[PDB]
Structure 1
Amino acid sequence: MKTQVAIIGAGPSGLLLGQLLHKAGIDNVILERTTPDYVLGRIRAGVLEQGMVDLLREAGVDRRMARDGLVHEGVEIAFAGQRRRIDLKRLSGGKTVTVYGQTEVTRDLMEAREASGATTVYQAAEVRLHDLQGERPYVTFERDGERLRLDCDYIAGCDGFHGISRQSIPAERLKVFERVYPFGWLGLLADTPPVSHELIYANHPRGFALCSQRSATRSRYYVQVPLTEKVEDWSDERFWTELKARLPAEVAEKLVTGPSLEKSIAPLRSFVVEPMQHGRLFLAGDAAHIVPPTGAKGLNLAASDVSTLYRLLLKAYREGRGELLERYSAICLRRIWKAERFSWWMTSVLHRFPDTDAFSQRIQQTELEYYLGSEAGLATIAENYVGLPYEE
């Protein structure tokens, strides 16, 4: 079989890239290691930037989002007995963020692809990339015991952190930057009304806590835990008690608790690889970089990578301007590094780090006091939170 653009991974990155391209008349095939069900079981993201929202509208998959999504105009940070609200809309110049789960975005994209008739091969086992530096690269994979070959012009590696794409580039050609945090996030999804109409990020001595949501009757809560914890050691009962302990009393007493639909621990890390392409292979999303969930940038950076790749592929196919693809990494890395710096900053001021001396604790507290009390400080959080502008 042959196609123009072969896409590895049917998560939001690949599906969004594949929708945009198909819409523009560029044939693409998506190869996914697992099943649609497995993909749909990942809870993950809840916060989307305006740029992600417009990209979904452009891809023609925004009906359900425009209806069910919640537009948020502010967020709250609670520390040292105080609760400070950041007016994102006012401080960022009218920009806002949208709360719509990643499961929903994925489901909408999967349905739009299903209907369009575009090719999608699930349970594509043992995917291997070949002739990346040639003019005719190809992908081999196993479907029901038989190994097929897919010929293409370009390959978009949208296979996540553990995908085959990044591994297929000669190690000596990549420079990795990584930071692993000494804690993870224990998340709990419940069918209960959220405790606030906006998100509450909390720095507490016992550790970080976050009050999020998915809709008016579905909440998502998180608490910072050491990497040595096991999810089975955390009953719903234990989670609620711990969460309550980390929140302001007035917030904790208004909390409607209930049994969990999902519970899991996500470890935290920062990771960037440079460059993000090799020959005819271009990395996008988690395949190229990871940001701690604190700044809500992962899925959103996946979106800007995809918007950039799509627009460069359009010029190549439509305008015969293939030389432009060489600019992929430079354009993306600029936005990636700034979003990494913000996610790193948020993570450092909101979490409890092991082995912290007196001076550092005081500086962490002072960072919050200064940034949340200065009009200029608030603006730096707001513009970064809503999302820095996409480069052209």
Structure 2
Amino acid sequence: MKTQVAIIGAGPSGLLLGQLLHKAGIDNVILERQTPDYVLGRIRAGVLEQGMVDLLREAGVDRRMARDGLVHEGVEIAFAGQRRRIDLKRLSGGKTVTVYGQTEVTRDLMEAREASGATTVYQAAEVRLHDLQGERPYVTFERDGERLRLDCDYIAGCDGFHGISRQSIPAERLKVFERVYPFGWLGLLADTPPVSHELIYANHPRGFALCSQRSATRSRYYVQVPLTEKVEDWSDERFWTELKARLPAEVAEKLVTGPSLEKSIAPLRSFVVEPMQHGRLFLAGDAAHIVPPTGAKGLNLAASDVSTLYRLLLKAYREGRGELLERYSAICLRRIWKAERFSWWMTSVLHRFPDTDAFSQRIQQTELEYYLGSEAGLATIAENYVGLPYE
């Protein structure tokens, strides 16, 4: 077969890039290793920046989001006896964030693609990239037991952290920066009403807790746990008792608990690779960088990479300005690093770290007291949270 842009991975990055390209007349083929419902089983993200919201509207897939997504104007941080609200809308100059599940976003894009007629090959096994530096790169995969070859101009690696794309660039060409945190997030999805109309991030002596939601009758909760814990040790009862123990007395008593629909432990990590391209291969989303969940940047960074990649490919295809594609990494890395910094800061001020001396505990508490009590401090949290502008 033959196409213009081959896309590896049908997660939100790939589907979003694919929809944008298709709408603009640039033919693309998506290759996914798993099945549609496997992809649709991943819970993940819940908070989206306004830029991603506008990107979905531009990809023409915002009907359901516009109807079901919730617009939040503030977030709360609870620490050592108090609860503080950050009015994002006034502190950021009128910007907000939208709560709409990643499963939903993926679902909406899958429907949109399924309808357009654009090619998508699920269960594409053994994907391999070839001739990344020639004028005609190609991808080979196995459908059942037949290995097919797909010819293209460019390849977008949107295959997540464990994808084949990043592995296909000569190790010597990339420079990796990584930080692994000594803890993970145990999340729990329940069909219960959320405890607040806005999220609650809480720093507690027992560790971090987060009160989120998916809708008015569906909540998503998290608690910081050691990397040595296995989800089978955490019953529903245990989770609720623990969550309650870490929240303000008045919040815990309003909490409506219930059986879990999903429970899992996600480990925290920071990861950036430089550069994000190689020949005719460009990496996007989790294939190029990972941020700890704390700042809600992962999917949002994937969206800005995709936005940049899409717009540079548009110029190359319709305007014949293929030289602009060399600028991909420079543009993306600027936003990536700023987002990585915010995610790291949030992670360090809200979590309980092992083997922390009295001094560093005091500095962690004061960081919160200063940023949450200063007009200039609240503003730095706010603009970063709502999302820094796309360049």
TM-score by length of 1: 1.00
Structure 1 gap ranges (5+): none
Partner of 2:227: 227
CA deviations 1:285-317 (Å, max 9, x no partner) are 000000000000000000000000000000000
CA deviations 1:43-72 (Å, max 9, x no partner) are 000000000000000000000000000000
Q: Which stretches of structure 1, 4 residues or more, deviate above 3 A after TM superposition?
A: none
Cα drift, residue 128 of structure 1: 0.1
* Structural RMSD (CA): 0.2
TM-score by length of 2: 1.00
CA distance in structure 1 between the aligned counterparts of 2:52 and 2:210, rounded to whole angstroms: 22
CA distance in structure 1 between the aligned counterparts of 2:37 and 2:307, rounded to whole angstroms: 26
Cα drift, residue 340 of structure 1: 0.1
Cα drift, residue 384 of structure 1: 0.1
Give the secondary-structure state (helix, strand or coil) at the position aligned to 1:160. Answer: coil
CA distance in structure 2 between the aligned counterparts of 1:79 and 1:386, rounded to whole angstroms: 21
Give the secondary-structure state (helix, strand or coil) at the position aligned to 2:10. Answer: coil
Cα drift, residue 82 of structure 1: 0.3
CA deviations 1:94-150 (Å, max 9, x no partner) are 000000000000000000000000000000000000000000000000001000000
CA deviations 1:153-191 (Å, max 9, x no partner) are 000000000000000000000000000000000000000
Cα drift, residue 87 of structure 1: 0.2
Identity %, equivalent residues: 100
Counterpart check, 1:147 vs 2:147: yes
CA distance in structure 2 between the aligned counterparts of 1:245 and 1:144, rounded to whole angstroms: 51
CA distance in structure 2 between the aligned counterparts of 1:80 and 1:115, rounded to whole angstroms: 52
CA distance in structure 1 between the aligned counterparts of 2:187 and 2:318, rounded to whole angstroms: 44
Give the secondary-structure state (helix, strand or coil) at the position aligned to 2:75. Answer: strand
CA distance in structure 2 between the aligned counterparts of 1:302 and 1:293, rounded to whole angstroms: 13
CA distance in structure 2 between the aligned counterparts of 1:273 and 1:144, rounded to whole angstroms: 33
Give the secondary-structure state (helix, strand or coil) at the position aligned to 2:372. Answer: helix
Give the secondary-structure state (helix, strand or coil) at the position aligned to 2:55. Answer: helix
Cα drift, residue 229 of structure 1: 0.1
Give the secondary-structure state (helix, strand or coil) at the position aligned to 1:373. Answer: coil
Number of residue pairs matched?
Answer: 391
Give the secondary-structure state (helix, strand or coil) at the position aligned to 2:134. Answer: coil
CA distance in structure 1 between the aligned counterparts of 2:276 and 2:46, rounded to whole angstroms: 26
Partner of 2:267: 267
CA distance in structure 2 between the aligned counterparts of 1:134 and 1:18, rounded to whole angstroms: 23
Give the secondary-structure state (helix, strand or coil) at the position aligned to 1:335. Answer: helix
Partner of 2:105: 105
Give the secondary-structure state (helix, strand or coil) at the position aligned to 2:43. Answer: coil
CA deviations 1:236-255 (Å, max 9, x no partner) are 00000000000000000000
CA distance in structure 2 between the aligned counterparts of 1:198 and 1:296, rounded to whole angstroms: 14
Cα drift, residue 37 of structure 1: 0.5
CA distance in structure 1 between the aligned counterparts of 2:57 and 2:179, rounded to whole angstroms: 35
